[PDB]
Amino acid sequence: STGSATTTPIDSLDDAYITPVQIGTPAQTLNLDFDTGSSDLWVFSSETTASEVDGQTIYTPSKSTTAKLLSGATWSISYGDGSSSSGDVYTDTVSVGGLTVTGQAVESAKKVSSSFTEDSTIDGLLGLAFSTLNTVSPTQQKTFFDNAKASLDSPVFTADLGYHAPGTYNFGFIDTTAYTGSITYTAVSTKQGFWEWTSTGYAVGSGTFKSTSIDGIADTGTTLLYLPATVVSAYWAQVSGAKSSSSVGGYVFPCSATLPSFTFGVGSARIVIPGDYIDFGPISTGSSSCFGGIQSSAGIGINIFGDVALKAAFVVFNGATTPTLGFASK
């Protein structure tokens, strides 16, 4: 089997991407944030505290003939940005882009933190990291990808995120028309539950490539590119007027600037992030100070290849017995 679904930016900055997901019978379509940095599929629901729901589409298990309460199971998650959610669990039929899993754990939110409430466009998350990170207790549950894997033509999914445009998540096949040149594959460590790999270095604009190992995670659920302070300082030093602002919470730059590209290494191959991808616009409405899309990972504890990086590539998440990651230009 295979599946293919379009993923759409939630706003003009590509802050996140939503992908329609069918849950239950008859189908209830919710727009979920596919997150390769976590492993819970959770949704706004009829059980979510009413004051914490503001415009989202909810899953109502009582209206699904295939929903079954997973008795005794609860979940609770906190994300790298400080947001959180928790609730109980149903199993139900879940389909993405034509690919159907029966008995998928659908985690129903009883509580969500303010950042989720305030984002009306995201109805939940669909985790695509390794199932070892799943928070369901007392019986850990598998991700949608893990459940689908054996039925897939090939045990892979791919992320093809757009810059200010829709893109695609495919399951079970590699669309050879979706990228240019070749796909370069690189080793993955699953020891932390993430799609963790080591970039071979970087360049800033037309500058020379610096060969240096950068361990980090491929995370579709993080907006920006978070790299070591040395790398990030080298980037922003090429932008006149750029500075790290403690008050704003990262590097800012004059909105009048033209940003240089940023290149990262994948083995001997190179992925170029155009300068425009690194512009996240005014810090506040009407400001002439703009927020940078490359930020320091210092104090996160891990480097994160988020959407800013991933959207510059066609990315293969290879879930073979020994997982690997593939990157191609596009």
From Swiss-Prot:
Q: Which domain of life is it from?
A: Eukaryota
Q: Which cystines does this chain contain?
A: C255-C290
Q: Does the keyword Disulfide bond apply?
A: yes
Give the UniProt keywords, A-Z.
Aspartyl protease, Disulfide bond, Hydrolase, Protease, Signal, Zymogen
Residue ranges annotated for the Peptidase A1 domain, each copy included: 17-328
Q: Name one GO biological process term.
A: proteolysis
So where's the catalytic machinery, residue-wise?
D35, S199
Q: Which reaction is recorded as catalysed by this protein? A: Hydrolysis of proteins with specificity similar to that of pepsin A, prefers hydrophobic residues at P1 and P1', but does not cleave 14-Ala-|-Leu-15 in the B chain of insulin or Z-Glu-Tyr. Clots milk
One of the record's GO molecular function terms: aspartic-type endopeptidase activity
Q: What is its EC number?
A: 3.4.23.22
Q: Provide the family line.
A: Belongs to the peptidase A1 family.
Q: What is this protein called?
A: Endothiapepsin
Organism in which the protein naturally occurs: Cryphonectria parasitica (Chestnut blight fungus)
Organism classification: Eukaryota, Fungi, Dikarya, Ascomycota, Pezizomycotina
